[PDB]
Paper text:
Here, we discover unexpectedly that a single mutation [name] Akt exhibits intensified autoinhibitory features with enhanced PH domain-kinase domain affinity. Despite the NMR HSQC analysis suggesting the possibility of structural perturbations induced by [name] mutation, the X-ray structure of the [name] PH domain revealed very high concordance between the WT and [name] PH domain structures, with an overall RMSD of 0.198 for main chain atoms. The structure of the [name] mutant was determined in the same crystal lattice as the WT protein, and their main chain conformations are essentially identical. In fact, apart from the mutated Arg86 residue, only the side chains of Glu17 and Tyr18 showed significant structural changes in the [name] X-ray structure. By contrast, in the [name] PH domain, the Glu17 side chain rotates away from Ala86 and the side chain of Lys14, and this rearrangement appears to induce an alternate side chain rotamer for Tyr18. Paradoxically, breaking the Arg86-Glu17 hydrogen bond by [name] mutation sharply increases PH domain stability and promotes a Tyr18 rotamer which enhances the binding of the PH domain to the kinase domain. The [name] PH domain displayed an approximately threefold greater binding affinity (KD 37 μM) toward the kinase domain than the WT PH domain (KD 107 μM), supporting the idea that [name] mutation stabilizes the autoinhibited Akt state by promoting the PH-kinase interdomain interaction. Differential scanning fluorimetry revealed that [name] has increased melting temperature (51±1°C) compared to WT PH domain (42±1°C). Notably, these [name]-driven CSPs have a higher magnitude compared to the CSPs due to the interaction with the kinase domain. This supports our hypothesis that the [name] PH domain is preorganized in a rigid, stable, conformation suited for tight inhibitory interaction with the kinase domain.
The Ser/Thr protein kinase [name] (termed Akt in the present work) and its paralogs Akt2 and Akt3 serve as key effectors in the PI3-kinase/Akt signaling pathway to regulate cell survival, proliferation, and metabolism by phosphorylating a variety of protein substrates. Akt is a 480 amino acid protein comprised of an N-terminal pleckstrin homology (PH) domain, a central kinase domain, and a regulatory C-tail. Regulation of Akt’s activity involves an autoinhibitory intramolecular interaction between its pleckstrin homology (PH) domain and its kinase domain that can be relieved by C-tail phosphorylation. Akt’s PH domain shows high affinity and selectivity for the phospholipid, phosphatidylinositol 3,4,5-triphosphate (PIP3) using its positively charged basic residues including Lys14, Arg23, Arg25, and perhaps to a limited extent Arg86.
Author numbering: 3 to 42, 49 to 121
The structure:
Amino acid sequence: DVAIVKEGWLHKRGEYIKTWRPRYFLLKNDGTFIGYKERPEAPLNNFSVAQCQLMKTERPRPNTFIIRCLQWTTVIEATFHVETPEEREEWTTAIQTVADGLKKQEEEEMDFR
């Protein structure tokens, strides 16, 4: 029963270039977070938000949020900008709710085996 939770345009900072480009992202309730060059082609970005930490910053762009994940030895970061703080709150709340549901599932599978 995997379904889209939230979708929309985000300004994503490149991990390589560090410039900002618009990407159309869809978040699903299983943690899938997929980003396209055009509103729906293979996606340009594809990663799970399970076990992510969300951070907010105002520099260099206001209304920035960062999704940070620790996987083996690597830190994955994804940096996004939206035009208003309200939109940032909408995205970070949606991502956090999905991540929290996945964490509950993880606890039910891993605790007291």
